[PDB]
Amino acid sequence: MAGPEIVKLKKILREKAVPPGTEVPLDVMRKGMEKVAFKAADDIQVEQVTVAGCAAEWVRAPGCQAGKAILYLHGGGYVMGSINTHRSMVGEISRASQAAALLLDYRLAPEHPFPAAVEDGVAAYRWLLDQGFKPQHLSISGDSAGGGLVLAVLVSARDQGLPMPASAIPISPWADMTCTNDSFKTRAEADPMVAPGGINKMAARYLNGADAKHPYASPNFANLKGLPPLLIHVGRDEVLLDDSIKLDAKAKADGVKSTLEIWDDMIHVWHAFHPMLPEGKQAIVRVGEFMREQWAA
Template sequence: MTSTTNDHYLPRGAFGAGSRRTRLAALMTRLTLRPMTNLLPTSRSGIEFSRRLVATSMNLFGPVPKGTRVDIVGDGPVRGEWVRAPGLTPGPRVILYIHGSAYVICSARTHRGLTARLSSATGLPVFTVDYRLAPEHPFPAAADDLESAYRWLLGQGYTAANIVIAGDSAGGHLAADLLIENDRTGTPQPGAMVLFSPLIDLDFELSARMERTRKDPMISAKAARGLVALYTEGHDADLPRLRLDLALARDLPPTLIQVGGAEMLRGDARRMHAMIDGAGGRSELEIWPDQMHVFQALPRLIPEAGHALEHAAEFIAHALDNPVVQHDSKEKVSR
């Protein structure tokens, strides 16, 4: 089903709505979490509190399934962890996951529940890169760590066509940067890409526009901009590796973008979708009504989380099984 440009005005009866639990979770988050995140300072103590708060929330509402195998990796500049669903057998395909949270807050461990469920849904092992965080490690530390991890996987014997890039939030910006750098250096591009609530505009101007019509339940554009600034501080906002333009890159992988209809990054999702289309790539944009930021990570709160991962798994399987590049672009709103 094709959407109009103003997804937040879509008729509920025609396109479906989030479940009652989803809408209640968004309301409670807006009343409790949003005031806190908007007031927390970007001082060291404020950041540490934010890190503990998010880690606790992710573990509570998206715990790691029993039987998940986790292997920590530290190989030179490459840090991260392998996450494998129970009973997973080795194969030639792999997912490289890039966690989000403004370059400042999360880690491979906070996202272990999400990557474990992604491994289970796809039947693929997931390597989550544990990139260095700001403010301790500002730009381009995170981008460099991701590039090292991608080349490390190639060195481990995985072909680029069998690598899936997946990520959320700031991980979307890092993924786009990786594709541009691959094009610049002549490194083969991955076989597919799946992004959850990707961030592309580090100035948060797109988010501010979205907030004029619907406030994000989790955080304001202003507060999120303050966190990201800890990563970009001291650099020109127009630096090509910060203000990314995917339309300049070639051979982009088929991409699935999922974003919540209640979150401010739906403007960023549309921008990334349009850039991939402009570069001649194939992109599918799913706008999930009433959903919050990276709702896929919160299955205990959000009934639709599992359905979204199933969609992602289907997309990945189809993209890897049908590697011929198709120069078209699709946008749809999912129920």
């Protein structure tokens, strides 16, 4: 059944990984993601902007429609990640969708704990709408921590009277901080990426004493009535599989139009590895078709 690339990518991930008791300090972790981050295609142009007091970059592939925009929330556990780490994958999401991405460098824990990143998001989305972007022309997308953050923004912004955008594509969402799901054991051998209580210590760092079940911290527990069509990518072989099944069933319970795709043999944000993974390339293609189907409706 399994691609030759994912087998090789799996084997490499496993080769270069730290061995878990290992407490890698925060900024050793941060410096690593930065240094190994893939370089965007050079047909991606970028334009640095400041949004809600945060650094951002409009990320435009070739072929964008003006009027359409992605608000993008990067992964990294709420503790790490940046515009630089994520520009590759996003520019290809910008390509696939033919929409420019706003790629926020929202406030990271522990220097800025929860709900700091939710505020940046909400405020970023308000900012988009104030640049004259109609909700119908907007989309929110993100990976790992950033895929839960997507939902935590949509919930927050709804409670605040903000119109919903046309779509929401969480990628491998981390939508439950209390990290409890069957998958933390069942999928744990097969995940070369999420370990942990590497993830446990991230929650620690982001919550900083807050209720792990706080709807904006963990949107798997939020009321989701009214959020717009969801496309949710997860991989089979990930510790976060349950996050995505629980959230799909919660969306549906709440009245949401929700499509969960579980992609067999795949890892965490397998997207991010499109330069070397036919599936990352395929799944990015599909994020954008769906931001595009939601835009035609």
